[PDB]
Design a protein around this ligand. Structure first.
Ligand SMILES: *[C@@H]1O[C@H](CO)[C@@H](O[C@@H]2O[C@H](CO)[C@@H](O[C@@H]3O[C@H](CO[C@H]4O[C@H](CO)[C@@H](O)[C@H](O[C@H]5O[C@H](CO)[C@@H](O)[C@H](O)[C@@H]5O[C@H]5O[C@H](CO)[C@@H](O)[C@H](O)[C@@H]5O)[C@@H]4O)[C@@H](O)[C@H](O[C@H]4O[C@H](CO)[C@@H](O)[C@H](O)[C@@H]4O[C@H]4O[C@H](CO)[C@@H](O)[C@H](O)[C@@H]4O)[C@@H]3O)[C@H](O)[C@H]2NC(C)=O)[C@H](O)[C@H]1NC(C)=O
Ligand SMILES: O=C(CCN1CCN(C(=O)OCc2cc(Cl)cc(Cl)c2)CC1)c1ccc2[nH]c(=O)oc2c1
Ligand SMILES: [Ca+2]
Ligand SMILES: [Ca+2]
Ligand SMILES: [K+]
Ligand code: NA
Ligand SMILES: [Zn+2]
Length: 805
């Protein structure tokens, strides 16, 4: 119940939202149908439009007018944004030369530069170049401020997930807004774009920037705007708030534009109808900058121009229908469109089997434009599993396509030409970032970065301590003139043991054999030095990774590789090796085909055993350091140590062998040597974090050998590829992956073909950031470089996307 008989007199765009049944005057009241009776008359004035004219200059103040051209308007903070231009011979901000803003130039009584977040729905990254001729205000922010070529959204590339990620620094799986549509089985409640459930605070997890600000004594404007408040009025409201007294004035504000998303859905991302929405957004930016300039705030405020996601060409005719695959289609509920999520129509249906649904959806049509996944098998880079609101079955949809349950869903609802929601590495889904103001750098381009990082930077801009989030605080310090965040490297929790030769061959009863009994003081001291770490500076380029949890492990040195060997998991946490451009690939000799050798530095009790692999008819083994890349026939024996062995499904070995035998040497040739760190990952509860021993769901039959869920590799070289990886003076280049350790290649529809036709495509899909691997392993990499720690944090957040320009 709303007692709408209260009044908005003196309350228009109140920041403190008053509680029912008292009627509301805030920028959301319209959305809750709760505004006081006189809200439109008092708060949404339109009389005489939005622009001063020659005739209105020095006019008598008429309080019915939308904005003012009277002599008192600047003191009152309610001038039309073009007042000084029309009435005082001033220039529009866009016509002024760019001048470096070295220091905040703020009015007396400003404690900190305000932040204004100018958020634009569906603003695709390529609009900055393709629309530059029609967006002069935005082009001036972009060229004079700090900009990225693009900013990577979160998956799914939908509105609410991305806006709430911007506000919180969290993955959707953690903030809980995992789609524009959601069912929460614990609440038994549905979140929809239309209707009231979405306003319930139980959907919205983490701590958004406006709450972080308020809790630390920093006042915030209300970020959400009702669609019916015109953009001109949102801008005049922000400018009025900025004119409040020091004790009442917010330090942080958001503007939101429904464009260009709204038009992009109707006309496609580059439809000729898209020019006018881009012009209209640019005019709004011009109104804000002219308005700041009038208030002497244009060299005081930090402005962020940011999008939520891009926009792709999508039409009704590019729809896959589940009714073409499933006999049982009425037994499922599909969340449809540019992604799919499937659950049982009824939890009382005992016959519902997700295994049968996945199999019916797997590689059934030659050009099939979606791929089914159990959510724990999705690429780890999506971080899209650890939430009860994410259905177990997921459909990753090809760019330009939709999935729907039945044809009647598509033509009983063509109209639309654009959509978004696809995989967040897709070029069409990329969005924009520009930072302009005293705290941002001047005329600076920064590399592309992920929107999860912005919450930390917005906290840096406001002097706030950020709530715990998925950003890497410091990874964006290169955007900032000042207020940088200078973290310390995490403390190593476990120190390694450095075992020497402690066990005799005959103490091992592992069921292992090797034809290695083939026999010199020249090269007997040489092998001793290799085992004491004489080549370690060649194979461990960036220091040993730090172990950030309590465990028992050993450093093992060899001629060609170094490893941190876990006594708890009976395998390496990490294996490190350098392959020069000149390295040669060799075969596994016939005599060593099934060779596994005891490691005399490591107790039989802390070793794997071959008999477990022989007995396990599903499980085989591979090697973390590839025998194919041994430096010499004698060094190759080291690669067959039981301490280099890891459990591998035969289906996965096809992937691993091709990576090790073909791709490592290819990368070394292309990059002028590579350093590789490889290892296992255990994430049985799909939370993106290292499992403890007691979370492991699968062992090699009859053993305590745990089965990884994933295998990682981090492949580092010199950004200046004229310098070899092992002699690099400057910045580094990295590519990484987290390959799912699966007992089939059902993910790869072309897997019956030679590995050269499908393994690289699989590895590209499972590209990762070093930071993703850190979360999954509890390791901290790049501890010992020449480089600034902030530069290393940027490197650790890099994602190699394999997309074109
Ligand atoms: C991305 O960044 C985020 C933020 O840093 C990381 O998320 C954190 O991960 C931590 C580890 O998973 C997690 O810590 C847990 O917190 C529990 C208390 O949580 C509540 O309070 C916090 C603080 O106010 C709040 O943020 C939480 O919010 C979550 O839950 C609500 C639902 O009520 C959601 O609205 C909100 O969206 C958020 O959901 C997300 O997190 C939860 C898990 O907390 C997920 O289940 C959701 O799917 C969603 O992803 C909560 O309101 C605390 O109880 C936990 O403690 C257990 O574990 C410790 C281990 O140290 C153990 O020693 C304790 O005894 C305890 O065990 C007991 O409980 C077990 C579970 O019931 C039980 O099995 C045992 O038998 C024991 O009795 C734990 O400390 C932290 O909450 C989240 N924070 C957020 C915001 O998500 C995330 O990891 C990062 N991602 C990556 C890849 O790095
Ligand atoms: O329903 C909507 C939008 C609903 N609101 C979004 C939030 N918004 C707003 O003012 O957010 C401001 C804001 C909030 C936050 Cl958390 C963070 C910041 Cl940086 C800024 C008001 C409109 C919509 C829009 C586009 C869509 N495309 C599509 O397929 O479905 C769509 C639905
Ligand atoms: Ca959107
Ligand atoms: Ca885990
Ligand atoms: K086996
Ligand atoms: Na296959
Ligand atoms: Zn949209």
């Amino acid at each position: 119940w709303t007692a709408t008989s209260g009044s908005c007199k003196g309350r228009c765009f109140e920041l403190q939202e008053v509680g029912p049944p008292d009627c509301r005057c805030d920028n959301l009241c319209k959305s809750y149908s709760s505004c006081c009776h006189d809200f439109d008359e008092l708060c949404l004035k339109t009389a005489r439009g939005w622009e001063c004219t020659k005739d209105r200059c020095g006019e008598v103040r008429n309080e019915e007018n939308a904005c003012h051209c009277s002599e008192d308007c600047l003191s009152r903070g309610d001038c039309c944004t073009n007042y000084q231009v029309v009435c005082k011979g001033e220039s529009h901000w866009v016509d002024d030369d760019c001048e470096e803003i070295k220091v905040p130039e703020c009015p007396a009584g400003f404690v900190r530069p305000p932040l204004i977040i100018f958020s634009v729905d569906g603003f695709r990254a390529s609009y900055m170049k393709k629309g530059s001729k029609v967006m002069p205000n935005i082009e001036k922010l972009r060229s004079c401020g700090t900009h990225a070529p693009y900013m990577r959204p979160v998956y799914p590339t939908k509105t609410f997930p991305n806006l709430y990620t911007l506000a919180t620094g969290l993955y959707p799986e953690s903030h809980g807004i995992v789609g524009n549509s959601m069912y929460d089985p614990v609440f038994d409640a549905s979140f929809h774009l239309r209707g009231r459930e979405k306003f319930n605070h139980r959907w919205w997890g983490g701590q958004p920037l406006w709450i972080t600000a308020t809790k630390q004594g920093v006042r915030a404007g209300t970020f959400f705007w009702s669609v019916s408040i015109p953009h001109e009025r949102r801008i005049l409201t922000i400018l009025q708030w900025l004119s409040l007294p020091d004790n009442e004035r917010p330090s942080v504000y958001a503007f939101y534009s429904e464009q260009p998303d709204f038009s992009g859905h109707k006309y496609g991302p580059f439809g000729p109808e898209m020019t006018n929405p881009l012009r209209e957004i640019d005019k709004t930016v011009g109104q804000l900058m002219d308005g700041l300039k009038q208030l002497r705030l244009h060299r005081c405020v930090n402005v962020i121009f940011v999008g939520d996601h891009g926009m792709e060409d999508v039409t009704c005719d590019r729809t896959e229908f589940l009714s073409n695959y499933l006999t049982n289609v009425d037994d499922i509920t599909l969340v449809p469109g540019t992604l799919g999520r499937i659950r049982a129509k009824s939890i009382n249906n005992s016959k519902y089997d997700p295994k049968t649904i996945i199999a019916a959806l797997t590689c059934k049509k030659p050009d099939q434009h979606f791929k089914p996944y159990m959510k724990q098998h999705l690429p780890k880079r999506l971080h899209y599993a650890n939430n009860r609101r994410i259905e177990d079955i997921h459909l990753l949809v090809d760019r330009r396509w939709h999935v729907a349950r039945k044809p009647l869903d598509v033509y009983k609802k063509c109209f639309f030409q654009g959509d978004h929601g696809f995989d967040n590495k897709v070029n069409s889904m990329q969005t924009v970032f520009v930072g302009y103001g005293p705290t941002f750098k001047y005329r600076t381009k920064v590399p592309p970065f992920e929107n999860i990082e912005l919450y930390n930077v917005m906290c840096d801009l406001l002097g706030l301590k950020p709530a715990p989030n998925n950003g890497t605080h410091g990874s964006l310090n290169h955007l900032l003139r000042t207020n940088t965040f200078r973290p310390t490297m995490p403390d190593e929790v476990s120190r390694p043991n450095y075992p020497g030769i402690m066990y005799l061959q005959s103490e091992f009863d592992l069921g292992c054999t090797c034809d290695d009994k083939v026999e010199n003081k020249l090269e007997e001291l040489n092998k001793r030095l290799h085992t004491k770490g004489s080549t370690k500076e060649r194979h461990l380029l960036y220091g040993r990774p730090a172990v950030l949890y309590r465990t028992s492990y050993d450093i093992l040195y060899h001629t060609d590789f170094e490893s941190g060997y876990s006594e708890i998991f009976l395998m390496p946490l990490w294996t490190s090796y350098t392959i020069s451009k000149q390295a040669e690939v060799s075969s596994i000799p016939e005599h060593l085909t099934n060779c596994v050798r005891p490691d005399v530095r490591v107790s039989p009790g802390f070793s794997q055993n071959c008999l477990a692999y022989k007995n396990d008819k599903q499980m085989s083994y591979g090697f973390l350091f590839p025998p194919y890349l041994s430096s010499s026939p004698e060094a190759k024996y080291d690669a067959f140590l039981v301490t280099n062995m890891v459990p591998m499904y035969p289906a996965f070995k096809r992937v691993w062998a091709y990576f090790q035998r073909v791709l490592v040497k290819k990368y070394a040739s292309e990059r002028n040597g590579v350093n590789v760190i490889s290892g296992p990952i255990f994430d049985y509860n799909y939370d993106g974090l290292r499992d403890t021993e007691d979370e492991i769901k699968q062992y090699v039959e009859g053993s305590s050998i745990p089965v990884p869920t994933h295998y990682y590799s981090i492949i580092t070289s010199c950004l200046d590829f004229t310098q070899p990886a092992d002699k690099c003076d400057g910045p580094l280049s990295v590519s990484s992956f987290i390959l799912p350790h699966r007992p089939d290649n059902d993910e790869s529809c072309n897997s019956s073909e030679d590995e050269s036709k499908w393994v690289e495509e699989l590895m590209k899909m499972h590209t990762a950031r070093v930071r993703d691997i850190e979360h999954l392993t509890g390791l901290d990499f790049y501890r010992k470089t020449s480089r600034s720690y902030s530069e290393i944090l940027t490197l650790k957040t890099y994602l190699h996307t394999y997309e074109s320009e």
